[PDB]
Amino acid sequence: NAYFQKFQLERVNLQEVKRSTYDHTRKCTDQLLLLGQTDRAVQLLLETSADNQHYYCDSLKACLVTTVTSSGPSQSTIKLVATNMIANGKLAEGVQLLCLIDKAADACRYLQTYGEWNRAAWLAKVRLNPEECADVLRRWVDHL
Amino acid sequence: FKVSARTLTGALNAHNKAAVDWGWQGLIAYGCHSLVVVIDSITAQTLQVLEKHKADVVKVKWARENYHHNIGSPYCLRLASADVNGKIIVWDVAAGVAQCEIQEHAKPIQDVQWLWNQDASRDLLLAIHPPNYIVLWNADTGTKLWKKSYADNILSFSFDPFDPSHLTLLTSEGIVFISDFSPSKPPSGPGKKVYISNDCLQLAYLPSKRNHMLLLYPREILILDLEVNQTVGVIAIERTGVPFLQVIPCFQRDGLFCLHENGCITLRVRRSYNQELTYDLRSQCDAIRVTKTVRPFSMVCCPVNENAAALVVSDGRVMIWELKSAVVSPLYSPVSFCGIPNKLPDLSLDNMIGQSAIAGEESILREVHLKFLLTGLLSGLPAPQFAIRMCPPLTTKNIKMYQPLLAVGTSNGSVLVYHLTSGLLHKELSIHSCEVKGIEWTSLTSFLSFATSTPNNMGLVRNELQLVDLPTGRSIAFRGERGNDESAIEMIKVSHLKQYLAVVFRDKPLELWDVRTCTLLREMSKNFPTITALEWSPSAREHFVFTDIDGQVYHLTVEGNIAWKGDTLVLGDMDGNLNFWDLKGRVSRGIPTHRSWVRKIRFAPGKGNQKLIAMYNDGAEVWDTKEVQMVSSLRSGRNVTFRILDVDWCTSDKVILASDDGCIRVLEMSMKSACFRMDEQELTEPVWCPYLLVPRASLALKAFLLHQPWNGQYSLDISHVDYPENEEIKNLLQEQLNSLSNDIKKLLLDPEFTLLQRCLLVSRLYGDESELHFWTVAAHYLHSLSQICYDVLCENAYFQKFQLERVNLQEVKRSTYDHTRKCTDQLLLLGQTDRAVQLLLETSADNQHYYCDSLKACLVTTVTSSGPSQSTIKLVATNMIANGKLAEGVQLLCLIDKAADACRYLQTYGEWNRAAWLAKVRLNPEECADVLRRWVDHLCSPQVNQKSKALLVLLSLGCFFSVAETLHSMRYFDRAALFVEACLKYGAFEVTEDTEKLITAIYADYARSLKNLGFKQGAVLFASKAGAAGKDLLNELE
């Protein structure tokens, strides 16, 4: 797992070095947020131009990722908003939120529920303790 | 018995429906046919009549007194009136002389209203010029300021009582909002227009609730909120109810005065004790009879105390109603009386009921009941076609009991009696059942009147002749039982000695009667010529002359069984010629007047007067009998607009004229309109009005009442104080003081009636705004620190509760997503984050703003804690402010921990009102003081000129010493001295080493003002308290 995580860090650094436009900055931010790099993600988030129409959601995301480092009080409303975000149809933002807040196993379950098995397997490899990754690997094998 | 020139007013016109106003000076003015009439309420009698307009008057408005009064700007009466010809006249009621005439085009003026914010300029007037023009005029020089054109049909406008820069317009299409009103430049653009889903009757603001206005409908009343543009409360009547006609809002208490179509006046007070606003009926009056001929026009209410109402009726009757208090949501008496906790609950409405409170929330609770009582009633002249007659002239034998009574006929059989020196109605008697044709007097107290019924098919007319004695009122028939089928009577004659009487018929011969005996004397035979005109000889034998239809002249004398006086006979004709026959000269002098048919001619009373009055079809003329010349002329159309129906002589130097519009005027030989003044007028009962006095006496009276303990003893007469002025002014001052009501006098003669209550009571009597508002706030805060009408002058807890109630109503009536967005923002800014989370998680899965919105509810729940990871939240929040979005970033700053920082950013960008609201709701009472102090400096800038508001804000903060500093700087020595004395009594600041310089200066300056005024006792008393700086005044005054 450490070897694969090191390779993922290497490729995400390579991608971040050669960012060109806004269509790639959002993808790089999503990859950094799903790969665990949160300390360096806030600076990249706080770089959108003042004329872009996504400035307010991006600022809100930066404030949240700064503020959501805790995992104690007020963690039920976050679960409800995450789950109904998944239910409404927007899966990528929802799974991003789940991986952000406190949990990745439920994110993997939801991802495999909708049929995105490869991304769920990648997420389970980069994230999660080896005690819970065994179960997701077993269900992936069973589906295969 | 001196008689003064004056006029009497009668019925009103359809053009005077909305011509009435009740100013702060305490006088009621309403528009007559072409005149302005000023009457009082407590006294209920006519004071002054104004005559300059050439057409009907449609609008009358009083001046606004919201400024400090001194020698340069003393108390005065100013009135503005408009006609259908587009002429606006600024009036001086005291002298009855116009000051400014304004005319732009020839169209009726839709609406005229004065400006309440007059800190810098006190003579600003705004009026509507049709069709789509509004012009700001100057009341001092008549100079236009700016002119604005629109693309609608403006009907009325209203001003915002709180923000002077906000103006609203009511058009036929919708409502236009202006947020850039300023006396320096015209409005920039058309403004914001909103469409209402035509029949609107009135659009006015609510002075009790900020950002609220009411819409008047025949069967509904709508209350709207500005920032939401939605209805938050509806007032409706039942199915079996009378539709509304007019609504008058209240200021000191949240109440509404409503007028119905049947003349009923109802009072509604906001519910306060046990979701939309509800108003409950409290008191009701009794309606009047409704007929096609009589109907109410409008009503007005007194703004000084708001405890009375006045009703104007089409026949000229004015009804005054008074509100009384005695001990169905409950109402409770207020703990504080006259500012601070013998009582006079009926002094004003604020002392009748308590302050508003939120219903549904947990010592002494006394129930109060309100009722309407009718205490005044005025009457005017009846419908046109009068028949006037004058009492016999003054002689040397009846001088001891002479009275210049005037008799006026009516078409309903009524007789009107006036005294002609006080202008008051004396007697009203109903005698006949038809129109009165002629009135003749048999003595100084008795007179006769006759009337004729309608002709029948044959032509015979029932004849009624009655004898009336004024002191008793007995009516007795003169002829007797003459039946109901006989020729009618057209004229009757009574000789100079009141001995013989003549009755003439169309075809029945002439009948002589005796006045004293009341018996038939002698009857002409059938072979007698017809009678056309008849007259007696002014010089037991009496001679009378008559002319027949053939032109023959017959001279007959009576011994038991046309104009003439001295030895000159004057005859008229249908052509207009006025022959002048003389007995001694025996020469005929015919002077063709080149006029129409002459109606009736009469001479002047008094021996030696050779002047006459000639009445024509369209005017009157005055001629001289001795020398054939002309004195004065009056023609309908050339010099006078109205017609003439009857003429008469009042005295040897005045005449009486009757107009077609229902008015009677007394003029001179020149028949030229004069300027009646209130100084020479004689009045029966005294009238309390400080404005009528000279400027140097109104201020002197105020100082005398304010400091009551003069030499220990308490009194209301100047004789116990040294006031070196003339006796004429001293007598006038004494008369006004005796005119005060008994309850008011008792309150002044009260040793435990403190100084602060005296200031409020005096201000109420003088009817001022700035003085009353300043003392109301100062007294409450001084008492509070010793131990909704005002937006930012209330306590923190009181203000917070009402905003929470206000936002709750908005959330109930959400309709669209856009309205929800405002409600969510308000709740997060007020601190109700618990209830804002659920409302945020209701966005549909199709809206494009779903992504930020879902994350915003995500942020609010996790940001409730403020630890060490909050620095970057401020950094991005301050960055968001710098890129243009202010309100969106202020929400984030206030949300986390920082409301004080958000207030500073709002003030820097120019949102002063929002910053004060934010600091008032949140923040502890240690940081809120700093925010308001910065707002005070901006309000004191020479470009904002709102120093009145700045003084009130400083009082709220409790900085009494700062208030004393600024009051002395603005030359307010009258107010500054009172405030210093009150603060010392209540223990606000002591006389220490550094404050004594200001205290000494104020007393010395106030002493100088009194010395210039003339009051010496006050000057020496305050100069002694001054000390070192008052030594020079004492040495020069003594």
């Binding site: - | 009794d286 009582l373 009633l377 009696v417 007697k427 008697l429």
Partner: protein, 314 residues
């Protein structure tokens, strides 16, 4: 001869029609027709039953009885102001008029606030003495009194003063007042007890009236007004009436009993009535003529307050 019972059209107004139409114009019932009148009569009608059956038996301590609109004239109370040998009742028409109401107030010194206004007088403001009462009693010259709300009284008064004089009297402070009638002459039983509602013959107002009006040989009732609705200061006299009142059955029995017991029809006791009748008229006509410099109309304005009658200025 016969004894006659004088009445007014009010009794007629309040098989009956067969003789009612005759009473409307003729009004000349005889004892022969009263026989059928009684059978036809077998509250206003009820009180007539006792009156006719009473003046036939005894009353001689034997004359035919008729009914006209003669040796004894007996009228009823209260005679309406529209119209009006021996005579048991008012002697002069001024006794049954407003002028008598002022006369009784003048002698006693206690009474309701009164304001008599001359014909044609115009009122602009409500007098201060009448702003506290909730109900006012309005009496017009020749008409009957009535009670109207105080709230709307100026508009009614100004319209009613264009035809005849109007008298103003306060009725109740908090609503409709209480009126109690006390028959006279007074017996010796009610002059011993204390002041109670049942026995009101000890009021000081009646003590003065008993020594000047001579209420010992005439019948009627005295009305007292209580506007505070016991204490003697809450009751004041309102009106004095002469005759046999016919408006309630209880008062008729007491009034009629006081006639057959004290003997107000004995010739020995009737000779004292002539002396008393010729004395009341002279004093009443002097008081009326005093405040004056059918019934003459008033010339000046009179007001009654604090027990003193004076001239109202304005």
């Amino acid at each position: 001869k016969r004894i006659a019972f004088l009445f007014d059209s009010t009794l007629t107004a309040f098989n009956l029609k067969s003789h009612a139409v005759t009473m409307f114009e003729v009004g000349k019932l005889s004892d022969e027709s009263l026989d059928s009148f009684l059978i036809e009569l077998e509250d206003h009608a009820l009180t007539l039953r006792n009156t006719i059956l009473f003046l036939r038996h005894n009353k001689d301590l034997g004359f035919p009885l008729d009914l006209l609109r003669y040796t004894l004239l007996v009228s009823m109370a209260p005679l309406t102001n529209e119209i009006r040998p021996q005579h048991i009742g008012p002697a002069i028409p001024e006794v049954s008029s407003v002028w008598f109401k002022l006369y009784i107030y003048h002698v006693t010194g206690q009474g309701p606030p009164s304001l008599l206004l001359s014909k044609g007088t115009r009122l602009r403001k409500l007098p201060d003495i009448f702003q506290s009462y909730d109900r006012l009693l309005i009496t017009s010259w020749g008409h009957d009194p009535g009670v109207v709300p105080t709230s709307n009284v100026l508009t009614m008064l100004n319209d009613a003063l264009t035809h005849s004089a109007v008298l103003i009297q306060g009725h109740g402070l908090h609503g409709i007042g209480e009126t109690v009638h006390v028959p006279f002459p007074f017996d010796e039983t009610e002059l011993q007890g204390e002041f109670t509602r049942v026995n009101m013959g000890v009021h000081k107002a009646l003590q003065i009236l008993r020594n000047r009006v001579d209420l010992q040989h005439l019948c009627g009732y005295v009305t007292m007004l209580n506007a505070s609705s016991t204490t003697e200061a809450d009751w004041v006299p309102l009106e004095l009436c002469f005759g046999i009142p016919l408006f309630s059955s209880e008062l008729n029995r007491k009034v009629c009993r006081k006639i057959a017991a004290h003997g107000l029809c004995r010739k020995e006791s009737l000779q004292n009535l002539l002396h008393s009748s010729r004395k009341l008229s002279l004093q009443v006509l002097n008081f009326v003529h005093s405040f004056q410099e059918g019934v003459p109309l008033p010339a000046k304005n009179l007001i009654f307050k604090d027990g003193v009658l004076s001239e109202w200025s304005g």
